[PDB]
């Protein structure tokens, strides 16, 4: 039912209703001769959208917006970047000159200045601190402590019980690290709890890469965290 690499062809975006209002976004690209899915998130705001996350790159995010225009035909007239790394806020360009207003923490756009990545330009006061949580429009936007990134947002959606874990949560068919060149393996089973004790109620749990499921990732993402640090 959720979609994989092998139903989403290049440069192609797919939309997935999770629940009433809420859909994941699901785009690819190739690395080092492979195709990695990535997700992000779409929530109904009124009468328009706001978009947690870039569809990873300029190509797959403008066709982000004409799959949006296509099968939901509301505005997209925000967005959230999760953290700084490309599959978040690469297309960041793609949405400004869109008239999409971008937003991330002012730790993310630091980092993302530091990588010579795009920068969303809005800054998110209220989440600099571990267990940080702010409202935006739809979502609670929640900063757990640094995890995959020290800049990593979670975002709930309370109407539909869905965690939106991004990067900082492994989908349960991933058993190795992967990219943690600018995680804090110390801290991020602690910054997991975190999330645990503030969205216990979560019935949906989505992954920055592959299958959603439900609060056992964060728990298998401890899991494979730990074996790493002990590699
Ligand atoms: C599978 C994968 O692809 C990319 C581009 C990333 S990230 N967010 O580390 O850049 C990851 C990740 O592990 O989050
Ligand atoms: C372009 C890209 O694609 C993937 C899947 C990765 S990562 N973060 O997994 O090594 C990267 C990277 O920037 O390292
Ligand atoms: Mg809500
Ligand atoms: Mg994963
Ligand atoms: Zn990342
Ligand atoms: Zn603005
Ligand atoms: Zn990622």
Do not use: M
């Not at 797959?60 to 505005?75: D, H, S």
């Amino acid at each position: 039912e959720y979609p994989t690499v092998s139903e989403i062809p290049v440069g192609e975006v797919r939309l997935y209703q999770i629940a009433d209002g809420v859909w994941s976004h699901i785009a690819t690209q190739s690395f080092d001769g492979a195709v990695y899915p990535s997700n992000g998130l779409i929530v109904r705001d009124g009468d328009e959208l706001l978009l947690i996350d870039t569809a990873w790159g300029a190509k797959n995010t403008a066709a982000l917006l004409a799959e949006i225009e296509k099968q939901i035909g509301l505005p997209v007239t925000r967005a959230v970047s999760t953290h700084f790394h490309d599959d978040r806020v690469g297309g960041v360009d793609v949405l400004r000159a869109a008239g999409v207003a971008t937003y991330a923490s002012p730790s993310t756009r630091r980092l993302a200045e530091v990588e010579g990545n795009e920068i969303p330009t809005h800054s998110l006061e209220g989440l600099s601190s571990s267990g940080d949580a702010v409202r935006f429009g739809p979502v609670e936007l929640f900063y757990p402590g640094a995890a995959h990134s020290t800049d990593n947002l979670v975002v709930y959606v309370p109407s539909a019980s869905v965690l939106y874990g991004g990067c900082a949560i492994y989908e349960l068919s991933r058993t190795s690290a992967g990219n943690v060149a600018d995680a804090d393996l110390a801290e991020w089973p602690t910054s997991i709890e975190r999330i645990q004790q503030h969205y216990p109620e979560a019935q949906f749990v989505i992954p920055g890469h592959g299958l959603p499921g439900g609060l056992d990732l964060l728990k298998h993402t401890t899991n494979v965290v730990k074996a790493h640090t002990n590699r």
